[PDB]
Every structure is written in C-alpha cells, then in structure tokens.
C-alpha cells in the first residue's frame, strides 16, 4: 500500500515485420497474466520462434531481448490458420513465465525469465528517454510495417485466387495481374512505403475481374 | 514558440468490432496529415461507412462522434481485398479533412470538420479522466475484439477452404468441422471471450485434415 511492485517497461514478443507486440504494458502491477493468440507467417510453417522483448520501442531490434525459444510440431496449414496462444505470466516473485501453445495439438513450449533479468534502472531510464526521443521515427516504422503486411496479404491472397480461378480468368487480365504481383513482391523487399503502396494500387486497378470471379466462387 | 496548437484528444475512425482506430494521436502538433489503408468486412461489400471519432477510449461508442459518411461503388471482391485509403488532414486553421479513397476505382468521399467541432475543454478533461479511470475495462474490450476478429477470420476462411476442398474432405471430418463452425458462429454473436476461444480451439482440433488439403491445394 505504500509501495506497488510494477513493470518498469513493456513486455512482449517480436511479430511479422520485426515489430514489437506488447503482451504486458508498462507500469502494470504484479502478479499479472495476459494472453494473445498469434499464427504463422508462411504456408506449411512447422514452427514459430518466440522472441521475448522488454522495452517501449516499436522496432523489436530496438528493445532488450530477454530470450527466445521455438514451438515446433505445427501441422501443415495455410498461413494464418494455426492457433498459437502466447501467455506472459509474472508471479508474486516477479518471475516471468512465457508459454506458446499450439491449439490444434496442445503442444507447448516455455521460457522462464528471472526477476533480475532485463534492463537495470539506468538502462530503463535511457529506454524511456529513447522512446520519447524517437516517437516519430517509430510511428513511421509502425506505418511501414502495416503497409508491408497489407501488401503481403494482397500478394499472398491474389496468388491463391489466381490459382482457384484458372480458366475463368481472361488472358489479358492474368497477364496484368501477374506482372503486378511480381512488382509488388519486389517492392516488399524494400523499405520504401510509397513504392509498396504504388504496387498495391496497380494490382487493385488491374484485378477487378479476378475479384469478381473470386467473389462469385464463394458466393 | 511560446505556444503550439496541438490536438487535445486522439482522432480516428470506427473499425470492425466497434473499436476506435486512431489516425492522429493525442497531442500532435498541427498542421499534420496521416493515412492508413483499410478494407471491407464482408464479401461483395459495396460501401464502407467512415465514422469519425475524437477521444481516448477503445470502444468507439465511448468517444465523441464528429460525423460519418459513406464511400460506395466498391466493386465485388472477397472481403479484406478492397483498398480504402483513409486520410486525416488538419490544416493550419485547425480544420480536419477526412477522405476515403477506393484504390481500385479512385472514387473518393470526404467530410470536413470545423476547428470548433468536438469536445470542449471540460469534456476534454472528463475524457482524459474517464480513459485513465477505465484503462483496464478498455484493455479487456481490446482483447475481446481481437478474439472476435480472429474467430471471424477462422470461420470465414474455414468455410472457403471446405468449399475449395469438396470431395477431397472425408465425410467424418467435414461433419466435425461444420458442427464446429456453427458453434463458433453462434459464439461470435456473444460477448464471452472464453466461449469464442473454446469454439476456435474445437475447430482447430478437428480441422487438421482440411488444413493439409488447403495447404496442398496451393502448394
């Protein structure tokens, strides 16, 4: 009552795009337990890597790594379908227990992190400073990743739809679409937000027939 | 230099789940212009409603509505494929210009909001208070929506995959899957996070064959 034991920095994991996703927010009082369900980034992905982070930055690499572990045995499935439940649990002793559980198999892997692990009071100070000092740059990184991720969904989806469409798709249309997917894929390999959005726009402008087919196909 | 004109509250729009998505953060200095690309929530959706909000709450209904407008003319497409670019732009005069543009057609609709619109200094005060007073409840709503949205993706995806699979899927498997989809769909109609996660888990446990087929189908 005169004091309360809180998390000095945010705790989370690295997600697609190299962005930190927070499971336990800064200044949360312990004990505390939070969970979130994630999925795979690639089709037929057999394992996921859980990279535990401490910090306030948006870029995962800009935060303090507390450790990493893998959860394997994920059964073949389209990407984004597997259910990997990640749980962060800080007990009365300030020990952090991170678990990843495949909801299909029930398979689970854990990493335990001592209360003394992480950044010390000075590092914590520098961290809170760096974050405020770079709120803008992080916002930019934040939007780029959102763009990359949207373009990646578009690329992946469109390819599946072209396959499902087959003969239904006119030769002219398929030719424009496949040229646009190549450009989009090359763009995603970069760091230029505008270029990625340009390629997505192109794809959107030439995929109108494919969109109708795909829509009708499941309607 | 002695003063700077900033946004007292966050500005954004309502997204699927009835959650507020922020385009311009609290205390941003103007002029300022930010954009984000959204998509449709339903297959063959022909229009989207842009509901402009001012506030710090996670629940859209808990924030101040600044107005709404529709962007129609969206061409038939699977849900989540259309590219609707939403731009919030606050000029030197403090006037907010919100635009929604379909990247396929280039069609665009806008709503202009006077610098005097929104919550007054007292309301702003009450708002910042309410948010801190309800940070926990909002975190809960935040996770429920994330769950609802994940279950909705699972329901939608699985149904498409069952269709694409057809004969490839064993009678026993299809029967378990279709019973699980019905349960999941009923669960999404509720407010119980645990129930939705239970149904998603069930689906994950009985969809392992479908997952292999769907994966092989596009591999």
């Amino acid at each position: 009552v005169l004091l309360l034991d809180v998390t000095p920095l945010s705790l989370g994991i690295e997600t697609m795009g190299g962005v930190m996703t927070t499971l336990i927010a800064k200044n949360t009082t312990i004990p505390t337990k939070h969970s979130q369900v994630f999925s795979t980034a690639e089709d037929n992905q057999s394992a996921v890597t859980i990279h535990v982070l401490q910090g306030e930055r948006k870029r995962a690499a800009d935060n303090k790594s507390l450790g990493q572990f893998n959860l394997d045995g994920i059964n073949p499935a389209p990407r984004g379908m597997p259910q990997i439940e990640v749980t962060f649990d800080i007990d009365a002793d300030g020990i952090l227990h991170v678990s990843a559980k495949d909801k299909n198999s029930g398979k689970e892997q854990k990493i335990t992190i001592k209360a003394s692990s992480g950044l010390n009071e000075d590092e914590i100070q520098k961290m809170v400073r760096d974050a405020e000092a770079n709120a803008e740059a992080d916002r930019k990184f934040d939007e780029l990743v959102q763009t990359r991720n949207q373009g990646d969904h578009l690329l992946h989806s469109t390819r599946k739809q072209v396959e499902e469409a087959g003969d239904k798709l006119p030769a002219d249309d398929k030719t424009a679409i496949e040229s646009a997917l190549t450009a989009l894929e090359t763009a995603l390999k970069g760091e230029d937000k505008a270029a990625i959005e340009a390629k997505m726009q192109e794809l959107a402008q030439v995929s109108q027939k494919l969109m109708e087919i795909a829509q009708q196909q499941h309607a | 230099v002695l003063l700077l004109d900033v946004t007292p509250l966050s500005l954004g729009i309502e997204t699927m789940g009835g959650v507020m998505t922020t385009l311009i953060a609290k205390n941003t200095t103007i002029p300022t212009k930010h954009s984000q690309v959204f998509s449709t929530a339903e297959d063959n959706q022909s229009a989207v409603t842009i509901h402009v909000l001012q506030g710090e709450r996670k629940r859209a209904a808990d924030n101040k509505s600044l107005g709404q407008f529709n962007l129609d003319g969206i061409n038939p497409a699977p849900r989540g494929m259309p590219q609707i670019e939403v731009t919030f732009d606050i000029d030197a005069d403090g006037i907010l210009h919100v635009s929604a543009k379909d990247k396929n057609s280039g069609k665009e609709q806008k709503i202009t909001i006077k610098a005097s619109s929104g919550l007054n200094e007292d309301e702003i005060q009450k708002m910042v208070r309410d948010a801190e007073a309800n940070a926990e409840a909002d975190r809960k709503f935040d996770e429920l929506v994330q769950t609802r949205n994940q279950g909705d993706h699972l329901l939608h995806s699985t149904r498409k995959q069952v269709e694409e699979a057809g004969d490839k899927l064993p009678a026993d498997d299809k029967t378990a899957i279709e019973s699980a989809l019905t349960a999941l769909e009923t669960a999404l109609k509720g407010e119980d996070k645990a129930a939705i996660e239970a149904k998603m888990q069930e689906l994950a446990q009985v969809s392992q064959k479908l997952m292999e087929i769907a994966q092989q189908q596009h591999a």
């Binding site: 997600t15 980034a41 996921v48 990997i84 | 993706h153």
Partner: peptide, 7 residues
C-alpha cells in the same frame, strides 16, 4: 490476427 516467423 498477428503472425510469427520460423527462426
């Protein structure tokens, strides 16, 4: 829906 990679 947030995704993870294989490391």
């Amino acid at each position: 829906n947030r995704l993870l990679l294989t490391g």
